[PDB]
Amino acid sequence: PIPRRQLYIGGEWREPVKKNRIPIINPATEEIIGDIPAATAEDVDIAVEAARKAIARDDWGSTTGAQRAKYLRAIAAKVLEKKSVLATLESLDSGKTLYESAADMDDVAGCFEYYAGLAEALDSRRMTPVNLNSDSYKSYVLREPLGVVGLITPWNYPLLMAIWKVAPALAAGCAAILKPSELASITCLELGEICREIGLPSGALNILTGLGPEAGGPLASHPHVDKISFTGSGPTGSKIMTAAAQLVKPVSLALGGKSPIVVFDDIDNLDIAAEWTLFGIFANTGQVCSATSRLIVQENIASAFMDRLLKWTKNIKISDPLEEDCKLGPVVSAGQYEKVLKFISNAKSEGATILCGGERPQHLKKGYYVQPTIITDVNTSMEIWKEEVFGPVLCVKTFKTEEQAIELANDTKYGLGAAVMSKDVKRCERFTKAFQTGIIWINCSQPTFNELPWGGKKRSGFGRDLGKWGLENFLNIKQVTEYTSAEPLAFYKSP
Amino acid sequence: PIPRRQLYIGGEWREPVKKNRIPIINPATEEIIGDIPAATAEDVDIAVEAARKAIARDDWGSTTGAQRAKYLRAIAAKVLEKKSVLATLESLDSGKTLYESAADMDDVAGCFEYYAGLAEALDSRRMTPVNLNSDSYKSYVLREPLGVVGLITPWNYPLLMAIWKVAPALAAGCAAILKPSELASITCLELGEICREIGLPSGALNILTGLGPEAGGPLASHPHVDKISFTGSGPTGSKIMTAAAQLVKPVSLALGGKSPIVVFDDIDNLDIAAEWTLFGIFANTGQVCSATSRLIVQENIASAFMDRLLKWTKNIKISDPLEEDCKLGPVVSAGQYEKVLKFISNAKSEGATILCGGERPQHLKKGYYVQPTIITDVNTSMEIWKEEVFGPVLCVKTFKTEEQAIELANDTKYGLGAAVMSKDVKRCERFTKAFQTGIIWINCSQPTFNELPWGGKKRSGFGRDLGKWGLENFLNIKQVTEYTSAEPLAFYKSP
Ligand SMILES: NC(=O)c1ccc[n+]([C@@H]2O[C@H](COP(=O)([O-])OP(=O)(O)OC[C@H]3O[C@@H](n4cnc5c(N)ncnc54)[C@H](O)[C@@H]3O)[C@@H](O)[C@H]2O)c1
Ligand SMILES: NC(=O)c1ccc[n+]([C@@H]2O[C@H](COP(=O)([O-])OP(=O)(O)OC[C@H]3O[C@@H](n4cnc5c(N)ncnc54)[C@H](O)[C@@H]3O)[C@@H](O)[C@H]2O)c1
Ligand code: NA
Ligand code: NA
């Protein structure tokens, strides 16, 4: 049962000014299952106005962190109450398996749980005295809500990616304007209903669905948006930051990757190593920012590892995401599907081997299904090696030495995550410093915790999500200097 | 004795490729006293190459914080050894009084002293374990040098503004490329000589003089500059950030202000309050970012306060900055001089009173001297009230209530500093939260400490200089997750 909602502005459901709507497409069946509102510039001004009013009123602009946490704990409780419907809708809306969708629903409530406790602790650290080598000055640092924040998010983890920004923004005390992806907005709109259901103060959270240049764009060039927190592709981040530059507006950039997985011959279990290699590149149909999309395996175990990988890979169940025991679903859209398959075909033109998958599963007549693909005979000058595919596609390379492995791992414009599979501690530490990234996985690929800073360097962007970082991004920092002497400054001659 | 240097690149003095030079102008005498090298795009590539090589070599890319601190403590010791020549040159080069120039020389050494100790402590907090609710995962945060950093700085505190970025960049372990203002580059180039004199590793610090679009510009669009730390005017920050957006490059923005000074009738000393009001708007010939350029005085004391202010003001000695007991010098350039006087004249056209100064001092035939100016009969729709003047110009307004005072204080596009002069504690706290800025001064205007976060919000930009913030800006943050279980992931069916 697909819901039909409006834009969530000022605590009420509000229709878009131009009355425009965009379809909801089912990636498993290529059918229109509904429609979402498509906001425009005028809608963004109404939502910024609603956000500014929330910041000026008492039930939001004057709340303690503890008061704000009561609300986040209540949003977590509704997510957990409706886990089954939300997980089904996230699945029907993004193509993600019901299992991953329910797993993202647990993660979402856990994120509000984390930011609830952090909002309660925020009241304590609001005032931080800093000792000085002065008998005339008194100093402290005042932490306060930054104000109006624009939250532009991607479709890969529709609710989860949004929540990474919503949970800390609200914890910090900001009034947010959430703009999710036009490919997966069902759960974000439902978040609006949860907020109505928990009585969240009006304008505290504003959810605006619609096209990126149409609804995301004006938020980036709005003179009353204190900050834009952006997650998505690099070319989009450029456009956003370029617009935010005109208004000297701060913007955070969480972008893509071509993260490497380095496996060395000293692995205790070839079956556990291959299972992590699968999860790092085929979970979420490969549509993961930190996906370990380049496998740099040692020549020694390369022969053994590839056999187990492909055995495990050919075992991945590709079916309808709502089905029982499904391990792989379709990609999000038709445009994504073609781009992904164009990458597989471009690897053929260039001279690479398609050792596994690469074609459409013969049993699924409808939907954007791509077989999990493992490509070999890959050189550094190839687009497959060079660029983020965002499909269940893995390219493979061999090495002999540590130096060779480092060299290959860092031969990328990206710098999000990296995984190092080895039993040698000091080699795992060497890789910890050599990896020109923001995330290092030791003896796994992909698990994260709220308590940790998420982000990259190079073409993967700047800024850190999660941890205390994710909350501090939405805090304005005040220097409070007080002069405590009766004595005059002594600079300037007295009349 | 004016020095004639080259560009400081890779530990050696290197000539600019195009052989171009730009003059050094004396603001007190309007004479060419020398020339500085004017770097171009090709020069920026050589310096980025030098910076990348320093990051790849052992004597810089492998140093401990303690090793880096030995160097900063040595740069501080040379600054203090040559205090007298550097202070004279800063004065001849910027127009700043020898007193303020020597005071900036003390501040500079103190800043390296602060960042030396912070570099020593950096080694300890390099690895930070974060406890988890997991018996299978182990996590910690790795802090490391960010890499190659571009440091674009203004002429108001030539050496001091540069040092605010140089001291933390070098403490953090980055290889910096310093680009100072073409109006005041004498001391920054001399910093190059100090670095030669202390044996600072090659490429660790690269100093590139020259025009902003010519030498600052390519640094902003260079693909191998990890981050741009920018201080200067808003329109410049736009151009820099717009260029950094193409390469999704992080950039910090320390911009201008129209900071208010709120004085209430409950002041214990009218003479101490007026002296701080002078220092906040006439020190450095008003060329201060955080200058308290708008005085919102209470109607009650307005009559009394203005008499003492003007009495103290008419007492300010305007002479040659190298002279004995000089309290005000000339503005930096001819272009600045005209812009500043155009503001004073624009206040006349608009309907304001020029209660004090506004004209050129009758006794100085040469130089860009402007009398300290106090303008009254000022309304909110006036450019004088609205925009940063960057001259010794103060505009004045009266109020009756707290609400009226807050309203006037925040009626600006800026948001750098703010000063509140009152004996009422809870009123000083109310103003602490109401002031829509990044710096609050209680019972003073302008003093800062290294230990404090410097920066603003709104049109004054984003990011924080100084404190641990200033060092963390130059640290890449790594998430280190390690899987410690023998058990398989359980996601994906085993073959
Ligand atoms: N670094 C991270 O933490 C992280 C997390 C998740 C996804 N990602 C990256 O996100 C990408 C997938 O997301 P996507 O396909 O939604 O990216 P995208 O760039 O197409 O769009 C992301 C969001 O920006 C909006 N948008 C598009 N054009 C815009 C414009 N002109 N102005 C303003 N907003 C605009 C979209 O509507 C959407 O909400 C991949 O590259 C992936 O690696 C990164
Ligand atoms: N917020 C702070 O902490 C702080 C501190 C000091 C000064 N300031 C602000 O700085 C301003 C005074 O400085 P200014 O006159 O040197 O400012 P500016 O904008 O004219 O230039 C600053 C620097 O940028 C360079 N630059 C100019 N155009 C450039 C371009 N196209 N690309 C790259 N670099 C370019 C200049 O050569 C110089 O080094 C005032 O507005 C003042 O309030 C702010
Ligand atoms: Na869709
Ligand atoms: Na000059």
PDB file of C-alpha atoms in Angstrom, chain A residues 7-200:
ATOM      1  CA  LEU A   7       5.423  18.460   1.282  1.00  0.00           C
ATOM      2  CA  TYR A   8       6.013  18.505   5.059  1.00  0.00           C
ATOM      3  CA  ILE A   9       6.332  22.208   5.996  1.00  0.00           C
ATOM      4  CA  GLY A  10       5.716  23.965   9.353  1.00  0.00           C
ATOM      5  CA  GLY A  11       4.294  20.888  11.089  1.00  0.00           C
ATOM      6  CA  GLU A  12       1.483  20.513   8.496  1.00  0.00           C
ATOM      7  CA  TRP A  13       1.218  18.726   5.138  1.00  0.00           C
ATOM      8  CA  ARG A  14       1.437  21.451   2.460  1.00  0.00           C
ATOM      9  CA  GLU A  15       0.747  21.093  -1.289  1.00  0.00           C
ATOM     10  CA  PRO A  16       3.511  22.326  -3.756  1.00  0.00           C
ATOM     11  CA  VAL A  17       2.670  25.831  -5.075  1.00  0.00           C
ATOM     12  CA  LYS A  18       2.869  24.702  -8.764  1.00  0.00           C
ATOM     13  CA  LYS A  19       0.913  21.485  -7.915  1.00  0.00           C
ATOM     14  CA  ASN A  20       3.614  19.363  -9.694  1.00  0.00           C
ATOM     15  CA  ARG A  21       4.306  15.650  -8.955  1.00  0.00           C
ATOM     16  CA  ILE A  22       6.880  13.085 -10.040  1.00  0.00           C
ATOM     17  CA  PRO A  23       6.319   9.289 -10.304  1.00  0.00           C
ATOM     18  CA  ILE A  24       7.500   6.533  -7.956  1.00  0.00           C
ATOM     19  CA  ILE A  25       8.926   3.685 -10.122  1.00  0.00           C
ATOM     20  CA  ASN A  26       9.240   0.087  -8.892  1.00  0.00           C
ATOM     21  CA  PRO A  27      12.758  -1.141  -9.935  1.00  0.00           C
ATOM     22  CA  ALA A  28      11.743  -4.867  -9.745  1.00  0.00           C
ATOM     23  CA  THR A  29       8.660  -4.411 -12.059  1.00  0.00           C
ATOM     24  CA  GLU A  30       9.280  -1.083 -14.011  1.00  0.00           C
ATOM     25  CA  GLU A  31       5.799   0.141 -13.056  1.00  0.00           C
ATOM     26  CA  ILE A  32       4.554   3.431 -11.645  1.00  0.00           C
ATOM     27  CA  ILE A  33       3.450   2.459  -8.070  1.00  0.00           C
ATOM     28  CA  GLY A  34       2.673   6.083  -7.057  1.00  0.00           C
ATOM     29  CA  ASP A  35       3.867   9.729  -7.051  1.00  0.00           C
ATOM     30  CA  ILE A  36       5.715  12.127  -4.749  1.00  0.00           C
ATOM     31  CA  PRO A  37       5.318  15.932  -4.616  1.00  0.00           C
ATOM     32  CA  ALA A  38       7.835  17.858  -6.697  1.00  0.00           C
ATOM     33  CA  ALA A  39       8.717  21.142  -4.762  1.00  0.00           C
ATOM     34  CA  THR A  40      10.119  24.289  -6.557  1.00  0.00           C
ATOM     35  CA  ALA A  41      11.885  27.584  -5.573  1.00  0.00           C
ATOM     36  CA  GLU A  42       8.683  29.122  -4.027  1.00  0.00           C
ATOM     37  CA  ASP A  43       8.226  25.944  -1.867  1.00  0.00           C
ATOM     38  CA  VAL A  44      11.888  26.254  -0.628  1.00  0.00           C
ATOM     39  CA  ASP A  45      11.127  29.875   0.568  1.00  0.00           C
ATOM     40  CA  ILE A  46       8.017  28.683   2.486  1.00  0.00           C
ATOM     41  CA  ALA A  47      10.098  25.899   4.108  1.00  0.00           C
ATOM     42  CA  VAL A  48      12.996  28.303   4.908  1.00  0.00           C
ATOM     43  CA  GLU A  49      10.396  30.667   6.435  1.00  0.00           C
ATOM     44  CA  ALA A  50       8.983  27.718   8.484  1.00  0.00           C
ATOM     45  CA  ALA A  51      12.555  26.796   9.585  1.00  0.00           C
ATOM     46  CA  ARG A  52      13.372  30.466  10.539  1.00  0.00           C
ATOM     47  CA  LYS A  53      10.043  30.676  12.562  1.00  0.00           C
ATOM     48  CA  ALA A  54      10.955  27.442  14.449  1.00  0.00           C
ATOM     49  CA  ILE A  55      14.354  28.996  15.355  1.00  0.00           C
ATOM     50  CA  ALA A  56      12.568  32.195  16.616  1.00  0.00           C
ATOM     51  CA  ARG A  57       9.758  30.387  18.604  1.00  0.00           C
ATOM     52  CA  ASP A  58      10.112  28.916  22.156  1.00  0.00           C
ATOM     53  CA  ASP A  59       9.153  25.225  21.592  1.00  0.00           C
ATOM     54  CA  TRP A  60      12.301  24.829  19.363  1.00  0.00           C
ATOM     55  CA  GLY A  61      14.595  27.878  19.541  1.00  0.00           C
ATOM     56  CA  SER A  62      14.641  27.693  23.382  1.00  0.00           C
ATOM     57  CA  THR A  63      14.792  23.876  23.951  1.00  0.00           C
ATOM     58  CA  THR A  64      17.410  22.107  26.057  1.00  0.00           C
ATOM     59  CA  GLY A  65      19.204  19.124  24.496  1.00  0.00           C
ATOM     60  CA  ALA A  66      17.298  16.789  26.892  1.00  0.00           C
ATOM     61  CA  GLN A  67      13.988  18.246  25.518  1.00  0.00           C
ATOM     62  CA  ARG A  68      15.221  17.679  21.965  1.00  0.00           C
ATOM     63  CA  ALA A  69      16.258  14.065  22.881  1.00  0.00           C
ATOM     64  CA  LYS A  70      12.708  13.181  24.106  1.00  0.00           C
ATOM     65  CA  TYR A  71      11.627  13.820  20.468  1.00  0.00           C
ATOM     66  CA  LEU A  72      14.448  11.807  18.787  1.00  0.00           C
ATOM     67  CA  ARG A  73      13.787   8.849  21.128  1.00  0.00           C
ATOM     68  CA  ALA A  74      10.093   9.139  20.089  1.00  0.00           C
ATOM     69  CA  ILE A  75      10.974   9.208  16.328  1.00  0.00           C
ATOM     70  CA  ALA A  76      13.184   6.083  16.943  1.00  0.00           C
ATOM     71  CA  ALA A  77      10.190   4.342  18.711  1.00  0.00           C
ATOM     72  CA  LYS A  78       7.820   5.012  15.736  1.00  0.00           C
ATOM     73  CA  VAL A  79      10.463   3.705  13.215  1.00  0.00           C
ATOM     74  CA  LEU A  80      10.699   0.501  15.326  1.00  0.00           C
ATOM     75  CA  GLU A  81       6.828   0.341  15.681  1.00  0.00           C
ATOM     76  CA  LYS A  82       6.359   0.514  11.794  1.00  0.00           C
ATOM     77  CA  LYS A  83       9.628  -1.439  10.947  1.00  0.00           C
ATOM     78  CA  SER A  84       7.731  -3.935   8.642  1.00  0.00           C
ATOM     79  CA  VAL A  85       5.788  -1.362   6.458  1.00  0.00           C
ATOM     80  CA  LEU A  86       8.800   1.063   6.205  1.00  0.00           C
ATOM     81  CA  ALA A  87      11.135  -1.813   5.264  1.00  0.00           C
ATOM     82  CA  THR A  88       8.694  -3.008   2.600  1.00  0.00           C
ATOM     83  CA  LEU A  89       8.314   0.537   1.194  1.00  0.00           C
ATOM     84  CA  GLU A  90      12.108   1.248   1.252  1.00  0.00           C
ATOM     85  CA  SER A  91      12.449  -2.049  -0.731  1.00  0.00           C
ATOM     86  CA  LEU A  92       9.625  -1.268  -3.261  1.00  0.00           C
ATOM     87  CA  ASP A  93      11.052   2.283  -3.593  1.00  0.00           C
ATOM     88  CA  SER A  94      14.871   1.590  -3.862  1.00  0.00           C
ATOM     89  CA  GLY A  95      15.156  -2.100  -4.970  1.00  0.00           C
ATOM     90  CA  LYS A  96      17.088  -2.996  -1.771  1.00  0.00           C
ATOM     91  CA  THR A  97      16.300  -6.490  -0.286  1.00  0.00           C
ATOM     92  CA  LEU A  98      13.730  -6.530   2.522  1.00  0.00           C
ATOM     93  CA  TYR A  99      16.542  -7.847   4.853  1.00  0.00           C
ATOM     94  CA  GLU A 100      18.872  -4.850   4.135  1.00  0.00           C
ATOM     95  CA  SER A 101      15.821  -2.554   4.271  1.00  0.00           C
ATOM     96  CA  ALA A 102      14.818  -3.886   7.766  1.00  0.00           C
ATOM     97  CA  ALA A 103      18.596  -3.669   8.734  1.00  0.00           C
ATOM     98  CA  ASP A 104      18.566   0.006   7.664  1.00  0.00           C
ATOM     99  CA  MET A 105      15.411   0.449   9.818  1.00  0.00           C
ATOM    100  CA  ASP A 106      17.270  -0.826  12.906  1.00  0.00           C
ATOM    101  CA  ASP A 107      20.298   1.462  12.061  1.00  0.00           C
ATOM    102  CA  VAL A 108      17.943   4.517  11.705  1.00  0.00           C
ATOM    103  CA  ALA A 109      16.408   4.080  15.222  1.00  0.00           C
ATOM    104  CA  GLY A 110      19.936   3.423  16.636  1.00  0.00           C
ATOM    105  CA  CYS A 111      21.111   6.736  15.063  1.00  0.00           C
ATOM    106  CA  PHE A 112      18.326   8.706  16.765  1.00  0.00           C
ATOM    107  CA  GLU A 113      19.187   6.754  19.952  1.00  0.00           C
ATOM    108  CA  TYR A 114      22.846   7.856  19.634  1.00  0.00           C
ATOM    109  CA  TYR A 115      21.954  11.528  18.922  1.00  0.00           C
ATOM    110  CA  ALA A 116      19.368  11.530  21.717  1.00  0.00           C
ATOM    111  CA  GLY A 117      22.089  10.794  24.338  1.00  0.00           C
ATOM    112  CA  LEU A 118      24.480  13.267  22.645  1.00  0.00           C
ATOM    113  CA  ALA A 119      21.715  15.996  22.826  1.00  0.00           C
ATOM    114  CA  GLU A 120      21.354  15.297  26.577  1.00  0.00           C
ATOM    115  CA  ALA A 121      25.136  15.568  27.034  1.00  0.00           C
ATOM    116  CA  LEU A 122      25.174  18.779  24.828  1.00  0.00           C
ATOM    117  CA  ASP A 123      23.572  20.856  27.651  1.00  0.00           C
ATOM    118  CA  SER A 124      26.622  20.074  29.908  1.00  0.00           C
ATOM    119  CA  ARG A 125      29.305  21.069  27.296  1.00  0.00           C
ATOM    120  CA  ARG A 126      27.297  24.228  26.163  1.00  0.00           C
ATOM    121  CA  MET A 127      29.742  26.305  28.296  1.00  0.00           C
ATOM    122  CA  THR A 128      33.396  25.189  28.268  1.00  0.00           C
ATOM    123  CA  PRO A 129      35.852  27.264  30.368  1.00  0.00           C
ATOM    124  CA  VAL A 130      39.335  27.580  28.884  1.00  0.00           C
ATOM    125  CA  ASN A 131      42.108  28.485  31.370  1.00  0.00           C
ATOM    126  CA  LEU A 132      44.358  31.369  30.405  1.00  0.00           C
ATOM    127  CA  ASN A 133      47.688  32.918  31.412  1.00  0.00           C
ATOM    128  CA  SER A 134      45.827  36.059  32.393  1.00  0.00           C
ATOM    129  CA  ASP A 135      44.713  37.604  35.699  1.00  0.00           C
ATOM    130  CA  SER A 136      42.626  40.221  33.744  1.00  0.00           C
ATOM    131  CA  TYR A 137      40.724  38.042  31.199  1.00  0.00           C
ATOM    132  CA  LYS A 138      38.170  35.257  31.593  1.00  0.00           C
ATOM    133  CA  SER A 139      37.414  32.905  28.667  1.00  0.00           C
ATOM    134  CA  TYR A 140      35.009  30.153  27.636  1.00  0.00           C
ATOM    135  CA  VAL A 141      33.544  28.605  24.443  1.00  0.00           C
ATOM    136  CA  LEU A 142      29.768  28.804  23.867  1.00  0.00           C
ATOM    137  CA  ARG A 143      28.279  25.984  21.639  1.00  0.00           C
ATOM    138  CA  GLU A 144      24.861  26.824  20.123  1.00  0.00           C
ATOM    139  CA  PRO A 145      22.546  25.713  17.245  1.00  0.00           C
ATOM    140  CA  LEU A 146      23.910  26.995  13.908  1.00  0.00           C
ATOM    141  CA  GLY A 147      20.395  27.873  12.679  1.00  0.00           C
ATOM    142  CA  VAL A 148      18.765  26.905   9.380  1.00  0.00           C
ATOM    143  CA  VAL A 149      20.340  23.886   7.655  1.00  0.00           C
ATOM    144  CA  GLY A 150      19.689  22.364   4.195  1.00  0.00           C
ATOM    145  CA  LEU A 151      19.859  18.591   4.001  1.00  0.00           C
ATOM    146  CA  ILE A 152      20.263  17.225   0.400  1.00  0.00           C
ATOM    147  CA  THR A 153      20.468  13.323   0.371  1.00  0.00           C
ATOM    148  CA  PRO A 154      20.919  10.232  -2.010  1.00  0.00           C
ATOM    149  CA  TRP A 155      18.538   7.244  -2.792  1.00  0.00           C
ATOM    150  CA  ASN A 156      20.947   4.352  -1.822  1.00  0.00           C
ATOM    151  CA  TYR A 157      19.913   4.366   1.839  1.00  0.00           C
ATOM    152  CA  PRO A 158      16.823   6.653   1.459  1.00  0.00           C
ATOM    153  CA  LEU A 159      15.827   6.982   5.124  1.00  0.00           C
ATOM    154  CA  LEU A 160      19.372   6.020   6.508  1.00  0.00           C
ATOM    155  CA  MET A 161      21.324   8.605   4.509  1.00  0.00           C
ATOM    156  CA  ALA A 162      18.831  11.310   5.457  1.00  0.00           C
ATOM    157  CA  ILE A 163      18.901  10.248   9.161  1.00  0.00           C
ATOM    158  CA  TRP A 164      22.744  10.619   9.262  1.00  0.00           C
ATOM    159  CA  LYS A 165      22.021  14.393   8.939  1.00  0.00           C
ATOM    160  CA  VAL A 166      18.511  14.708  10.462  1.00  0.00           C
ATOM    161  CA  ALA A 167      19.447  13.002  13.842  1.00  0.00           C
ATOM    162  CA  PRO A 168      22.542  15.282  14.517  1.00  0.00           C
ATOM    163  CA  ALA A 169      20.926  18.514  13.067  1.00  0.00           C
ATOM    164  CA  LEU A 170      17.893  18.090  15.384  1.00  0.00           C
ATOM    165  CA  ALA A 171      20.177  16.998  18.324  1.00  0.00           C
ATOM    166  CA  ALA A 172      22.214  20.233  17.893  1.00  0.00           C
ATOM    167  CA  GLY A 173      19.003  22.248  17.838  1.00  0.00           C
ATOM    168  CA  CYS A 174      18.935  23.347  14.173  1.00  0.00           C
ATOM    169  CA  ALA A 175      15.753  23.724  12.063  1.00  0.00           C
ATOM    170  CA  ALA A 176      16.337  21.408   9.059  1.00  0.00           C
ATOM    171  CA  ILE A 177      15.094  21.384   5.475  1.00  0.00           C
ATOM    172  CA  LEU A 178      15.457  17.802   4.172  1.00  0.00           C
ATOM    173  CA  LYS A 179      15.515  17.279   0.373  1.00  0.00           C
ATOM    174  CA  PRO A 180      15.768  13.527  -0.450  1.00  0.00           C
ATOM    175  CA  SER A 181      16.413  11.907  -3.885  1.00  0.00           C
ATOM    176  CA  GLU A 182      13.578  11.857  -6.483  1.00  0.00           C
ATOM    177  CA  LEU A 183      14.298   8.083  -6.854  1.00  0.00           C
ATOM    178  CA  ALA A 184      13.529   7.167  -3.244  1.00  0.00           C
ATOM    179  CA  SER A 185      11.415   9.642  -1.149  1.00  0.00           C
ATOM    180  CA  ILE A 186       8.636   7.305   0.269  1.00  0.00           C
ATOM    181  CA  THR A 187      10.300   6.759   3.706  1.00  0.00           C
ATOM    182  CA  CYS A 188      11.497  10.401   4.073  1.00  0.00           C
ATOM    183  CA  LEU A 189       7.907  11.609   3.541  1.00  0.00           C
ATOM    184  CA  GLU A 190       6.734   8.945   6.073  1.00  0.00           C
ATOM    185  CA  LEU A 191       9.297  10.446   8.482  1.00  0.00           C
ATOM    186  CA  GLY A 192       7.097  13.592   8.175  1.00  0.00           C
ATOM    187  CA  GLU A 193       4.070  11.598   9.346  1.00  0.00           C
ATOM    188  CA  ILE A 194       6.107  10.160  12.324  1.00  0.00           C
ATOM    189  CA  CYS A 195       6.997  13.767  13.213  1.00  0.00           C
ATOM    190  CA  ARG A 196       3.298  14.727  13.101  1.00  0.00           C
ATOM    191  CA  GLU A 197       2.571  11.535  15.199  1.00  0.00           C
ATOM    192  CA  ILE A 198       5.234  12.487  17.861  1.00  0.00           C
ATOM    193  CA  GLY A 199       4.260  16.186  17.785  1.00  0.00           C
ATOM    194  CA  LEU A 200       7.718  17.505  16.694  1.00  0.00           C
TER     195      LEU A 200
END
